[PDB]
Amino acid sequence: DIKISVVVPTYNTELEGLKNLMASIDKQTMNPDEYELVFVDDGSTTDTYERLQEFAETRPNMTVKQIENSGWGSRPRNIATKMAKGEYILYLDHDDTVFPETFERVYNFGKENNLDVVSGKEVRTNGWSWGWKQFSENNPHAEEMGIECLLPMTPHKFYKREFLLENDITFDDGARVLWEDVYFNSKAFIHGAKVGILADYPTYYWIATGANNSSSFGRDPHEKWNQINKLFNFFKDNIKEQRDLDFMLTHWYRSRVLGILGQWLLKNNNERIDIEFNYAKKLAEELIPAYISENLDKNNQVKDYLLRQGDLDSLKKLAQIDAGITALSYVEDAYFKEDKLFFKTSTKMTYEDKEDFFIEKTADRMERILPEEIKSKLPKEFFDYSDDLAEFTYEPSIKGRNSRATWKIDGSTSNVEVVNKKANLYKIEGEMSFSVQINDYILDAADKKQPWDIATRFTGLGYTSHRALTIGKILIKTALINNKTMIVYKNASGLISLDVGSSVRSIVEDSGVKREQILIDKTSGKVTIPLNEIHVFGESLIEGNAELKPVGISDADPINVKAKLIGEANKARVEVLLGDEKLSGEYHLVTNIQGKKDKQQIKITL
Amino acid sequence: DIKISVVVPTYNTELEGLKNLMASIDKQTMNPDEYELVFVDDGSTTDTYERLQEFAETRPNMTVKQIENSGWGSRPRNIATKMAKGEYILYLDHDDTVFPETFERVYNFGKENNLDVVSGKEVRTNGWSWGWKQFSENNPHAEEMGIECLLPMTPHKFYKREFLLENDITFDDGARVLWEDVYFNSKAFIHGAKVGILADYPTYYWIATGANNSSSFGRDPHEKWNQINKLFNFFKDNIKEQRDLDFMLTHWYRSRVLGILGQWLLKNNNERIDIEFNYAKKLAEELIPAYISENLDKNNQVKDYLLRQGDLDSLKKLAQIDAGITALSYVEDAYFKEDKLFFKTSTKMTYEDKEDFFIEKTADRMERILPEEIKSKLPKEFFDYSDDLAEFTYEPSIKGRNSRATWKIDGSTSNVEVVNKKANLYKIEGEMSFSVQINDYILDAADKKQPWDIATRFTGLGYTSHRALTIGKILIKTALINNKTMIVYKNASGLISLDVGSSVRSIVEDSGVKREQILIDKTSGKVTIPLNEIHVFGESLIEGNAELKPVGISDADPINVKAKLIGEANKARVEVLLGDEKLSGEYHLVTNIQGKKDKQQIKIT
């Protein structure tokens, strides 16, 4: 009785990625006798099928089958679903990987709460978030929130196999379609799936390669909007719950239809803009009710209005007025305190991190700044930000540079003010203070030695700016906290990074060394090297080593000796143990804690 | 009867650079009967000597001579100076050029005021200024200021030949030559030269190339500092007036000795740092008197005190703390009013255009923010800025992108405030308002069709930040002012540029067209294309042409037509006068005013 079936459609699969896929499944904490691997090759030209069988040689739970090419992943996933015998199915693409505890955590979460779909936290290579809303907390009763509980609607979730089979839930392969994972997840919810969200552990890594697509399907504007029309018609005809239908109509109208009416207009030729604008206008009139836009922000209500009027020229004019609106955060102070790293940051809305972004106070109204030729074409309520000045968000986030996983940094406090800069003009300014407990984000053992990058997420007046936290001054601060070496620093791009476990930087080199305070107890053979500036909390002992070379003998072998990085009584030191090495004269001394050597140029005389 | 002699030392000269040099000499407004060219070739490995003899065949006023290679430009200039016959000598290098009206303006200024040296405005390829202080106004009595009137001490000035001969002022001839033009200018002032500054017209273009400033001295630390000791010994031995000695001592101590104790410490290896620090310490103790440090700003006093204490570790920490301090200006407003373009800018001292730079208030002192380890080692007055919160400057400037010439924009009002942001911390914020009268900077004819780049200059607390003016939002605004097409815009690098004369952009393209208000007339064959967004001041009548080409023809060869951009009242228009040419049909209309053609998709049938 198999707990999990891994459905993997392959087609001309790149060999290295296929090997990484196999290693990520082999390293599951779940016992191998309790999951199943089903690979369906979709008529590959490469030796992919031969290699899939070569992989299946060593695995009594991996099944491989070859069919002729179907042009997409829908057909192989459906056949593999009919071949599977596990309780839950994971649709794993041939270029992705899975985190090592995914199978065990997901199944126990699904079995305990009797879930039909488990939406586990998904990681993507690029970006500072993915599912920032939906992956914010575990929710075993997520389907009570509505169909939103399945976003983002990738197919990389865990589905109850008998639920799919009893409701005839398959990927649309009889027709050629984009967003097949959106159809698949919506059908799952329409038939009443009990959904749970597992957000406290990264379950799936969706990897950005360089060859994600090479087909003629979807690249032209006519096929694109044919697919968009088919998706909206699918919602209006199949979603029976009014709340769920309104969510899907609002979410997809805002992102894919109104989404071409902003900066997109500045990145495309007039021939393409004219084609897509007419399609979008026609869809709004034909499929999108007027009430959908009443629950949108002021800016999206402006785009919706001008779209239905065919006033593309005003939209182009608005795209240029809006070009560059953003909110970058600067570090006001960064310091360690007890076992945490503390930050104080500040931001404001600007054009491209330069002059201030402004709104106007006219009478009792807080208005968007527009030329009077634009304001004379719009309902006056659509550029009035009065009822929106308290809807600002300002939050920190972190991202592991190895795992690519992103997390919100909890416990932060912020405050956004609408301040009168000059005359009747108002700028928007934010301040925020937060701390980082690095253990919150260390889930796999690999996470203990990793660089982390800090970012801030600012939303308001309809704009969203999620950008790396930055600092102008040189920032280098080290800490030895409960056996964790930590270095917060301005990296070479001017952004804020945090190294933990000497992944990229040397804590001895960044702390400095009191050279004139080095002690040499030659009877015990112990060389003590006090570190200069370092925040030490708790007791630490990190084993490492060091290298000695006789000065002047430039070709000499390193003399390998043991070393210890010690934190105690809020001081840090490196102790080098000479041991049985007989030494006489001056020597270069280089410490090697956690695989990172210092550049302090230490010389001792023995 | 020669007014100017042009001394040109040559050595393996690039042909194109020499041809440009010869071209800029021929362009002089002065009649060639009143100037001469004296070339001394320092024994070139290339054909440079035979190229010089070729240009001198057609010009009777050019003398060419070759010598054995001396290794530097000092000896060839000295030899050309003995054979020159003019009243004034200009030392011109084999990779530079001269502005068209230099000879005439310099001689007239020098002869009117009986000057031994005319220090004319020098222009460099890179940077937003050159001689920002000395080249700020004309001064026929510049020697009243002291030896400072000759900075920057390049050899690219005009020297009365009789004055050089009578005082035996020659270029330093040696096997190891460095800053020879500093000695030459200093010796000129030591011998009591009447100096005049010609600031209102750019006289010399010192060009940067791919082969500049590559020699053993200045590339090797031991020879570099041996030359620095020669220069300071020269100052104390030869300069006799205390005012001039104090200036040269302070200037060169600050810039070349203390100048390695800042950001230089973060760009060099510890081996070279130790070598040059010990040289700098020994030189400060032996050649620089103690009172010299009292002429310096607070940050330089700190560097001087820690240098004499040999405290390199504190200096390295201070450089780390100081890294990135700057001041970037943003456009708060930019608009055309009357005949000028108006700007409202703002700035604050920051680290790399990010978080604020702060100073800290304690009791009655405005202190630099420093760690206690360093504050404990410093005299208390040296990190107290309170006496220096008054001496901020905030000024605008312009640079011609073709001529490379830089100018200060006058008439601006600015205000720098020290603002208590939070707690006891104080930031430094400045506001500025200025206008641009482009006729101020149009001197030569080529200056009419040029891009102009705008910059701001901020100084205070010992920092100097001269950087391009920048804007984030899309900025495109056009103007037609007294027969001038002017377009202020954000360029491809996010900086403020002003195109005058359509050197980059089509003013019709950026202005828009009232398409429905196109007045047609077969009575005279003149169509009228009104312009939408443009600031029109005064009457304008620009000349140009246009084309007419039908729709959808394979080998469509257009027909050329006359066009005129008209500026009348507060509105602007294009008059594509046809008269008599072709027949009818659906054609296009691409105007071509001042060599720039619009792309607004105009069709007339």
Ligand SMILES: O=c1ccn([C@@H]2O[C@H](COP(=O)(O)OP(=O)(O)O[C@H]3O[C@H](CO)[C@@H](O)[C@H](O)[C@H]3O)[C@@H](O)[C@H]2O)c(=O)[nH]1
């Ligand atoms: O003719 C084909 C083409 C693709 N595939 C399979 O389709 C999957 C996705 O292909 P991939 O190269 O990973 O595309 P991506 O763009 O990275 O994948 C995203 O976009 C796809 C297209 O919508 C979705 O199917 C995926 O779930 C989604 O992660 C893989 O298992 C392939 O083997 C086939 O089996 N046959």
Ligand SMILES: O=c1ccn([C@@H]2O[C@H](COP(=O)(O)OP(=O)(O)O[C@H]3O[C@H](CO)[C@@H](O)[C@H](O)[C@H]3O)[C@@H](O)[C@H]2O)c(=O)[nH]1
């Ligand atoms: O063996 C040589 C080498 C150079 N030169 C001349 O030296 C002059 C300056 O050299 P250049 O190639 O122009 O270099 P730059 O770095 O541009 O020159 C700057 O730096 C020089 C060294 O201080 C000064 O002499 C110059 O005036 C100054 O413009 C030119 O006229 C050369 O022909 C010679 O006569 N003989």
Ligand SMILES: [Cl-]
């Ligand atoms: Cl440009």
Ligand SMILES: [Mg+2]
């Ligand atoms: Mg993929």
Ligand SMILES: [Mg+2]
């Ligand atoms: Mg040169």
